[PDB]
Structure formats: structure tokens, C-alpha cells
């Protein structure tokens, strides 16, 4: 309908509550393994943020897996920063992690993160 | 970290993608039954929006149910409008549905919706 009203803060409040569920380990349904570091998450949030996870969890066989192992070249801290960004909209981008975050965002197909990483790197060159 | 950058549109893009998953029936894990009308949804989104669903899906027995039957006094159209609001931030509030939406929001413990309904009713009195 064209007659709707909108609650401005709704989407951020939903994201804040999904993050709360993740911290309390409520209804998490997948473990992402990155070089033996394990991260519990919600498949729907991963699919909503990452082109790679969207492709994974829409596959008729992988949709049922409770563990997903990422490529061993992926940095666990880079993945952690990206998972926090998925659940909070905030990216902890630092000189010491930018290359790992950018490489991880390229792999996860998170184009907005790749774009800001490219801009920060270009600014330092 | 206090050094984070934030992507303003992230939370709304996540919500838009969760709604897309719902429309395509991807990874929906519960059917909410309202007077024999059935609504497929994601438990995490319901818990993130509604105090009632948060209480339901954090219960050690109900967390495992794939069907939840609501009170027969709940109006299916009112529930539909609220479920759409959960997934989009947009509330289709109309003269013909406001009482049903308000009663449903009180039952689902969705205080911001109850508040706008009270304001619209008070304005017409």
C-alpha cells in the first residue's frame, strides 16, 4: 500500500536484537569455521549480508549443513570484523587489518565493504 | 571499538533482504496460524520484533515448534499487517484496520505500533 507510515528506527532495532540473539547464542543455526576458529551465526543474517552466503544457503544440499568451512586463506580476525559488521552496520577498519578485511569482503561478496577499503587504501597511496 | 565507521543503509538493506527471503520462502522455520490462516516466517525476525515471540522462542520447549497457534481472537489481517511491518518497517494503518492492528500489536507486545495506533485513534476522537 501507498498509505503506509514507517518507523524510522525499526530496521536498526531489528539488527540490534538479532545481534543480541547472536551474543546469547539464541537460535544460531550454523558454525562458520575459519582456520579452526569457530563463529556461530544465523544463516538468514549471513545470506542477507553476503553474496557468498546467499549462494551457499540457497544450494539444495548446503542449505542443510550446520558447519561451513571457509577457504584456509581467509583471516579469522578479518572474518570476525565482517561478521560484527553484518550484525551491527559498524566496521572496525584499521591500518593493521584493512588488507585482511578487504580480502575477506571480496571473498564474502560484500561490495560496500570492498568499496570503503579501496577508498581508504587509495587515500594512503 | 570506538574507531568504527558505519554504513548507514546496512540495517535497512538487511531487512529488505530478510523480506526477500520470506517472499521466496527461503529458510523460513515456523508457520504462525491465525484462525486457520497460515503465515510462514523466520523465528529470529519474529523474536527481534515482538515481545511475545521473544518469550515463545526462548522457551526451552516452544523454541522447537514448527507451528505456533495464536489466540482465536486475533484478526488474521491485523497479524498480516504486523508481520509485513516486522519485515519492512512500514505499517499499513487504515481506518478499517486500526482497531485490529492495535489489538494485535498489544498481544504481540509491539509497543511502538501500539503507541502510533493510540495517537491516530486519539486524533479521531
Amino acid at each position: 500500500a501507498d498509505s503506509c507510515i514507517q518507523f524510522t528506527r525499526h530496521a536498526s532495532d531489528v539488527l540490534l536484537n538479532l545481534n543480541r540473539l547472536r551474543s546469547r547464542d539464541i537460535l544460531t543455526d550454523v558454525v562458520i569455521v575459519v582456520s579452526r576458529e569457530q563463529f556461530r551465526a544465523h544463516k538468514t543474517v549471513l545470506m542477507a549480508c553476503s553474496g557468498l552466503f546467499y549462494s551457499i544457503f540457497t544450494d539444495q544440499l548446503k542449505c542443510n549443513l550446520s558447519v561451513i568451512n571457509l577457504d584456509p586463506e581467509i583471516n579469522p580476525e578479518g572474518f570476525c570484523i565482517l561478521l560484527d559488521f553484518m550484525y551491527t552496520s559498524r566496521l572496525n577498519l584499521r591500518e593493521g587489518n584493512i588488507m585482511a578485511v578487504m580480502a575477506t569482503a571480496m571473498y564474502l561478496q560484500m561490495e560496500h565493504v570492498v568499496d570503503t577499503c579501496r577508498k581508504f587504501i587509495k587515500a594512503s597511496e | 571499538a570506538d574507531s568504527c565507521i558505519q554504513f548507514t543503509r546496512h540495517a535497512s538493506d538487511v531487512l529488505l533482504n530478510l523480506n526477500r527471503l520470506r517472499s521466496r520462502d527461503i529458510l523460513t522455520d515456523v508457520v504462525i496460524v491465525v484462525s486457520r490462516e497460515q503465515f510462514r516466517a523466520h523465528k529470529t525476525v519474529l523474536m527481534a520484533c515482538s515481545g511475545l515471540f521473544y518469550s515463545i522462542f526462548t522457551d526451552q520447549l516452544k523454541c522447537n515448534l514448527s507451528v505456533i497457534n495464536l489466540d482465536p481472537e486475533i484478526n488474521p489481517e491485523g497479524f498480516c499487517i504486523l508481520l509485513d511491518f516486522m519485515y519492512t518497517s512500514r505499517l499499513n494503518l487504515r481506518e478499517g484496520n486500526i482497531m485490529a492492528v492495535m489489538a494485535t500489536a498489544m498481544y504481540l507486545q509491539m509497543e511502538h505500533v501500539v503507541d502510533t495506533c493510540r495517537k491516530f485513534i486519539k486524533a479521531s476522537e
Partner: peptide, 5 residues
């Protein structure tokens, strides 16, 4: 909050 989107 509420607005006209």
C-alpha cells in the same frame, strides 16, 4: 519516530 516514507 513514525514518518510518511
Amino acid at each position: 519516530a513514525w514518518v510518511i516514507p
